[PDB]
Amino acid sequence: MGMIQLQNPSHPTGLLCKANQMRLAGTLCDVVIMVDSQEFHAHRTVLACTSKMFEILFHRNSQHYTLDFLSPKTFQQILEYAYTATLQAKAEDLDDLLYAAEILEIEYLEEQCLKMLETIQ
Amino acid sequence: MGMIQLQNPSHPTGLLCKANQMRLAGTLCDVVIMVDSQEFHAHRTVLACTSKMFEILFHRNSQHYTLDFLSPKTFQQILEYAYTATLQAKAEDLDDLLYAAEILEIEYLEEQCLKMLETIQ
């Protein structure tokens, strides 16, 4: 037969951009991540699609999830990466980020943190 | 100061790919869209980040939302586009897709459906 196809190469990027604007306004946020005192509002789908650990964690439903293997600062860093595809940090945060990245099982961050730590080394 | 930056250009695309695999398995789906008889399980964030109409609709919380301005077939088409960035259809579906696309306010689909209808014309 005959088919028509429309493909928007910007859609993934546009969708994540809007999710990030929703997270900053609190719109449709359905999970709170608790690190030390601080609360981080976010969307389960974005965190579960970024971290295999969160996808596994949310197997057990609750409104709040407490993480204590990392600081609020490291979590914010990874939360921004999940919602924008970029992470910014200080060189002294690399060991903290690698460890969080391995536990959360976010392949890109573990691979890149390792590669940066090793070439410096 | 000194900063380190890691940017994964594949992240948007990887995140949407995983959401699509989650939708097909039913994982973390938190909304059912009802069209004629058929039920479509999906994630609120993906639909609200794709359609300004769904972002507005979900302002009013409920587990189920009924759409009757389009057929199940057209909805499936747009549901696939939302989750993959590609839509496939038959040429005879173009008027149906444009209309659904305008009501749902999915700019890319309205623009492309219009452009295809007009160049054929």
The H-assigned helical ranges of B1-121 are 11-25, 44-50, 52-57, 72-84, 94-104, 107-120
Angstrom CA distances, A58 to A41, A63, A95, A103, B41, stand at 15, 10, 26, 15, 18
Q: Closest to A45 (Cβ–Cβ): which among B7, B45, B88?
A: B45
Q: Enumerate residues 61 to 120 of chain B having a beta carbon within 8 A of any beta carbon in chain A.
A: 81, 85-91, 93-94, 108-109, 112-113, 116
Q: Enumerate residues 27 to 66 of chain A having a beta carbon within 8 A of any beta carbon in chain B.
A: 27-28, 30, 43-46, 48-50, 55, 58
Q: What is the CA radius of gyration of chain B?
A: 16
Fold entry, domain B1-121 = Potassium Channel Kv1.1; Chain A (3.30.710)
Whether residue A18 contacts residue B49, with contact meaning beta carbons closer than 8 Å, is answered with: yes
Any idea where the domains of chain A sit in the sequence?
1-121
Beta bridge partner(s), residue A32:
A41, A64
Mutate to test the interface with B, among A21, A43, A45 (most CBs of B within 10 A): A45
B42 dihedral zone (left: phi>0; alpha: psi -120 to 50; beta): beta
What technique was this entry resolved by?
Answer: X-ray
Written as one letter, the residue type at B34 is: M
Q: What is the largest CA-CA distance in chain B?
A: 60
Residue with tokens 């300004």: B52
Q: What is d(CA A67, CA A42) in angstroms, rounded to the nearest whole number?
A: 14
Q: What is d(CA A102, CA A113) in angstroms, rounded to the nearest whole number?
A: 10
B35 three-class SS: strand
Report the sign of the C-alpha dihedral through residues A15, A17, A18, A24, in that order.
Answer: positive
Cβ contact A12–B16 (<8 Å): yes
Angstrom CA distances, A46 to A50, A121, B43, B74, stand at 6, 33, 10, 26
Q: What is d(CA B3, CA B95) in angstroms, rounded to the nearest whole number?
A: 51
Residue with tokens 């921004």: A80
